[PDB]
Design an enzyme around this catalytic site. Structure first.
Site, PDB file in Angstrom:
ATOM      1  CG  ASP A  54     -71.794  -6.880 -18.600  1.00  8.29           C
ATOM      2  OD1 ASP A  54     -71.003  -6.460 -17.752  1.00  8.29           O
ATOM      3  OD2 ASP A  54     -72.407  -7.932 -18.476  1.00  8.29           O
ATOM      4  CB  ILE A  72     -71.898 -24.935 -20.353  1.00  5.71           C
ATOM      5  CG1 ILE A  72     -72.643 -23.992 -21.309  1.00  5.71           C
ATOM      6  CG2 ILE A  72     -71.637 -26.310 -20.958  1.00  5.71           C
ATOM      7  CD1 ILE A  72     -71.945 -23.768 -22.643  1.00  5.71           C
ATOM      8  N   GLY A 112     -80.232 -16.051 -17.064  1.00  2.80           N
ATOM      9  CA  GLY A 112     -80.837 -17.385 -17.215  1.00  2.80           C
ATOM     10  C   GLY A 112     -79.786 -18.495 -17.288  1.00  2.80           C
ATOM     11  CE  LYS A 165     -78.037 -14.222 -22.772  1.00  7.79           C
ATOM     12  NZ  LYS A 165     -77.153 -13.031 -22.864  1.00  7.79           N
TER      13      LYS A 165
HETATM   14  N1  LIG Z   1     -74.729 -17.528 -23.010  1.00 10.92           N
HETATM   15  C1  LIG Z   1     -73.960 -16.758 -22.974  1.00 10.92           C
HETATM   16  C2  LIG Z   1     -73.052 -15.660 -22.969  1.00 10.92           C
HETATM   17  C3  LIG Z   1     -72.399 -15.497 -24.331  1.00 10.92           C
HETATM   18  C4  LIG Z   1     -71.725 -16.825 -24.667  1.00 10.92           C
HETATM   19  N2  LIG Z   1     -71.005 -17.550 -23.812  1.00 10.92           N
HETATM   20  C5  LIG Z   1     -70.541 -18.591 -24.512  1.00 10.92           C
HETATM   21  N3  LIG Z   1     -69.765 -19.629 -24.203  1.00 10.92           N
HETATM   22  C6  LIG Z   1     -69.450 -20.551 -25.127  1.00 10.92           C
HETATM   23  N4  LIG Z   1     -68.667 -21.585 -24.778  1.00 10.92           N
HETATM   24  C7  LIG Z   1     -68.129 -21.724 -23.390  1.00 10.92           C
HETATM   25  C8  LIG Z   1     -66.711 -21.173 -23.250  1.00 10.92           C
HETATM   26  C9  LIG Z   1     -66.371 -21.241 -21.798  1.00 10.92           C
HETATM   27  C10 LIG Z   1     -66.074 -22.699 -21.478  1.00 10.92           C
HETATM   28  C11 LIG Z   1     -67.308 -23.584 -21.660  1.00 10.92           C
HETATM   29  C12 LIG Z   1     -68.163 -23.183 -22.903  1.00 10.92           C
HETATM   30  N5  LIG Z   1     -69.917 -20.423 -26.384  1.00 10.92           N
HETATM   31  C13 LIG Z   1     -70.697 -19.375 -26.708  1.00 10.92           C
HETATM   32  N6  LIG Z   1     -71.176 -19.184 -27.916  1.00 10.92           N
HETATM   33  N7  LIG Z   1     -70.990 -18.507 -25.766  1.00 10.92           N
HETATM   34  N8  LIG Z   1     -71.735 -17.390 -25.876  1.00 10.92           N
HETATM   35  C14 LIG Z   1     -73.893 -14.463 -22.631  1.00 10.92           C
HETATM   36  N9  LIG Z   1     -73.948 -14.205 -21.330  1.00 10.92           N
HETATM   37  O1  LIG Z   1     -74.510 -13.872 -23.513  1.00 10.92           O
END
Ligand SMILES: N#C[C@@H](Cc1nc2nc(NC3CCCCC3)nc(N)n2n1)C(N)=O
Ligand SMILES: N#C[C@@H](Cc1nc2nc(NC3CCCCC3)nc(N)n2n1)C(N)=O
Ligand SMILES: [Cl-]
Ligand SMILES: [Cl-]
Ligand code: NA
Lengths: 348, 348
Positions: free
Chosen positions: A146, A27, A33, A50
Site C-alpha cells: 500500500d 489527527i 481505525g 495508531k
Molecule cells: N497511523 C498511521 C499511519 C502511519 C503514520 N502516519 C503518521 N503521521 C504522523 N504525523 C502526521 C503527518 C501528517 C500531518 C499531521 C501528523 N506521524 C506518524 N508517525 N505517522 N505514522 C498508518 N496508516 O499506518
C-alpha cells in the site's frame, strides 16, 4: 489530560514499562481505525498513536512485522499496548510511533496549489529513501502492498522520509496465494488491477514509480474511479500490453482484447524541465512485466540519484544530506556488488 | 458555430445523412474522452455527444449494444459519426444521445451538501425505473457492469430516469471469463472486489442496492480507496461472509482469514423512520451470495414500490407519474407471472 498505560518497548527488552503521555488529540480517522497525536511526559517527544481493532483469535501481523523492522527510513515503533475503545467488547492494539510533521501527500498538494512542482533535489532525496526502505523490507520477503503519498512521512527540515503503515504488509511466499484487493486506487500494479493472487514484491516498485511520476507531474499519472479507467491511462502511456506481458501479470487474462494504442513516448508525458534520467527511471519502474521492473536496490543505484552521491551535494536549506550511504549487509543482500555504486568513495 | 457531419441514425437503415448542430459546449470528461452538449439545427432538440477513440482493429461494442436497445429508461442513441479529435491521425466515434438535464449523482449531492435526504417518493420513482432498465438489458443477457449515480440520468419535471454509458456493458455467458476490473469504486459487488472473472448480471443488482442505500443514507454505504477498505465497510454491515458465501463469490478466496464481525441489524444502519420496506429491499439486494440477490424484475415487484402502483399517486409537482407499467413481453420474460403484481388493476 495526562494518561498512563503499561506498554511494551517496540524494539528492545520485552519488559513492560509505565508510559505517560498528554496533549492527546485525533489527527486521523480511517478504515484501519484512529490516529492520535500526543506528547510523552518524560521526554517531551511527540508521538503518533495508531489504534486498530485486534483480531482476538490470531496475533496481529502489523505488530509482528513492525517489531522486527529497524531502519532510518521506516517510522519507529516506540511502544505498543492493548486497550478498549469505541466499539463494545473489542480489544484495540495501540502502536506508539515517532511523530513526523509532514507526508509526501501534503507537501505534494502544497506545491500543486501554488501551481508549482517539488524541486527535483527533493524528489531524488525522498524517492531514494523510499527505495532504500523497500530494499530493506523486501530483503526479509516483506511486501508493503500500500505504497502511496499518504504513507510516506517527511520531516521537511531534515528532508528525511520514513515509510509508515504495515497494516497491509505481508511476507510473500511462492505458491501461497495473496488477496488481490490491497493497494490504493492510483498506485495499484496492473497485476493487481487484473486480480492476480500470485504477485510479488515488485508491486511496491510499481507503486513507487507512480509516486515519482506524480511528484514530477504535479498530479497522479494513472487516475480513475474504476480499474478500466486506470488501465486506459496506463495503456495511453505504456501502450497495449503484449500477450507475453499479460501472461506474466495474470495468465487468466491473456486472451482478452485490449484497447489498441501506440506507446506515448515518455519525454512528452512529463514537463519540459523534467530531467531525462528521471524519465528513464520511471520507464524502468512502470513496466508491465513484473520481473522486468528494477528492484528497489537497483533503483537506488540508478543515475537519477547520482547527484546524491556527489560529495559536494548540499540541500537548498544549506543543511547536509541525511544518512544515504550507511547500508547494512541485510540491505545489500539482494545484490552485494551494487555496494560499489551505492557506497561512493567519499563514504567508505 | 454550426457544425455539419455525416452521421448514421442509431436505428433504422445504415443510411449516412448530413447532420448539422450548434451551441456546442463541454459537459464532461473521462478516461473514455469528452462529452458535449449541442442543439440539432433542424429540430432544435438538445443532444449529448459522447466522443471516444475507435479501434480500427475490432468493432465498437458500446455502439453495437446501443443500436439494439429500445427502452423508456435507457438513453436513446440518435446518431453516430466518425471524426478527427485530440491525437492527430486517430479516428473518434461520436455517439449522439438524447439530452437529459440531470443525474442522480447531482441530485443526491445537492441534498447531501444541504444535510438533507431525497424524499422517498423520489427514491421509489428512480430505483424502480433503474430496476426496470436492468430487467430489460438482462433479458438479452447484457450486463451493464458500471451502475452508479453518474450513469443515472433523470428529467426533474417528468421524474423519468434513463440509464447511460454502455462502454462497460457485455453479454455474459456462463463459464466464459470476464474482466473483473469493471465497475466504479463504491458500487462493486464483493465478487468483483475478490477479482472473480466468473460472475453474472447480479453484479448490477448489487450496484443498484448500493445506490438505494446511498439515497436513503445521504452518503455511500461502502466507501474506500482500496478494495480492503471497501470490504471492511461491507463486513461491518453484512457481517463476516461464511465459507459457503465466499465460495459462491470466488472459490479461490475460501482459505483466507476475514475479520470476525457480527452483522449490524439492517434497521440500525439507516436513520430512524426510514421506511421498513426500503430497508427490507436493501437487505435482499446486498447479499454476498450472488444467486440470493433479487432479480431486477423481482425488485420492481417489491412492496417498497407499492405506492407507485397506487391509482391515486402523483409526483410532488402535481403531474402524473411517468409510464411505469407498460411492460413488454421481452421485459417480463424472466418471470411472466410477476405481471400480476407489476401491472396493477387500474392499468390493465
Ligand atoms: N497511523 C498511521 C499511519 C502511519 C503514520 N502516519 C503518521 N503521521 C504522523 N504525523 C502526521 C503527518 C501528517 C500531518 C499531521 C501528523 N506521524 C506518524 N508517525 N505517522 N505514522 C498508518 N496508516 O499506518
Ligand atoms: N456521455 C455520457 C455518459 C452517459 C450520458 N451522460 C449524459 N449527460 C447528459 N446531460 C448532463 C447531465 C447532468 C449535467 C448536465 C448535462 N445527457 C446525456 N444524454 N448523457 N448521457 C456516459 N458515460 O456514457
Ligand atoms: Cl419499454
Ligand atoms: Cl428531484
Ligand atoms: Na460462481
Amino acid at each position: 489530560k495526562v494518561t498512563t498505560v503499561v506498554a511494551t518497548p517496540g524494539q528492545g527488552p520485552d519488559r513492560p514499562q509505565e508510559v505517560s503521555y498528554t496533549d492527546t488529540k485525533v489527527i486521523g480517522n480511517g478504515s484501519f481505525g484512529v490516529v492520535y497525536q500526543a506528547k510523552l511526559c518524560d521526554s517531551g517527544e511527540l508521538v503518533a498513536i495508531k489504534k486498530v481493532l485486534q483480531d482476538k483469535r490470531f496475533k496481529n501481523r502489523e505488530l509482528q512485522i513492525m517489531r522486527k523492522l529497524d531502519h532510518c527510513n521506516i517510522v519507529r515503533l516506540r511502544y505498543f499496548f492493548y486497550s478498549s475503545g469505541e466499539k463494545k467488547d473489542e480489544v484495540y492494539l495501540n502502536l506508539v510511533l515517532d511523530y513526523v510533521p509532514e507526508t509526501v501527500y501534503r507537501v505534494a498538494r502544497h506545491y500543486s496549489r501554488a501551481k508549482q512542482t517539488l524541486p527535483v533535489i527533493y524528489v531524488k532525496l525522498y524517492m531514494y529513501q523510499l527505495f532504500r526502505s523497500l530494499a530493506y523490507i523486501h530483503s526479509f520477503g516483506i511486501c508493503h502492498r500500500d505504497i502511496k503519498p499518504q504513507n510516506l512521512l517527511l520531516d521537511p527540515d531534515t528532508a528525511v522520509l520514513k515509510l509508515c503503515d504495515f497494516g497491509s504488509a505481508k511476507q510473500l511466499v511462492r505458491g501461497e496465494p495473496n488477496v488481490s484487493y490491497i493497494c490504493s486506487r492510483y498506485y495499484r500494479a496492473p497485476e493487481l488491477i487484473f486480480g492476480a493472487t500470485d504477485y510479488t514484491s515488485s508491486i511496491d516498485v510499481w507503486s513507487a514509480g507512480c509516486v515519482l511520476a506524480e511528484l514530477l507531474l504535479g498530479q497522479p499519472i494513472f487516475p480513475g474511479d474504476s480499474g478500466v479507467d486506470q488501465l486506459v491511462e496506463i495503456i495511453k502511456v505504456l501502450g497495449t500490453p503484449t500477450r507475453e506481458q499479460i501472461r506474466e501479470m495474470n495468465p487468466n487474462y491473456t486472451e482478452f482484447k485490449f484497447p489498441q494504442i501506440k506507446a506515448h513516448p515518455w519525454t512528452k508525458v512529463f514537463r519540459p524541465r523534467t530531467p531525462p534520467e528521471a524519465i528513464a527511471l520511471c520507464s524502468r519502474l512502470l513496466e508491465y512485466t513484473p520481473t522486468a521492473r528494477l528492484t528497489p536496490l537497483e533503483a537506488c543505484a540508478h543515475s537519477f540519484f547520482d547527484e546524491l552521491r556527489d560529495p559536494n551535494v548540499k540541500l537548498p536549506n544549506g543543511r547536509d544530506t541525511p544518512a544515504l550511504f550507511n547500508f547494512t549487509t541485510q540491505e545489500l543482500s539482494s545484490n552485494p556488488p551494487l555496494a560499489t555504486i551505492l557506497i561512493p568513495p567519499h563514504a567508505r
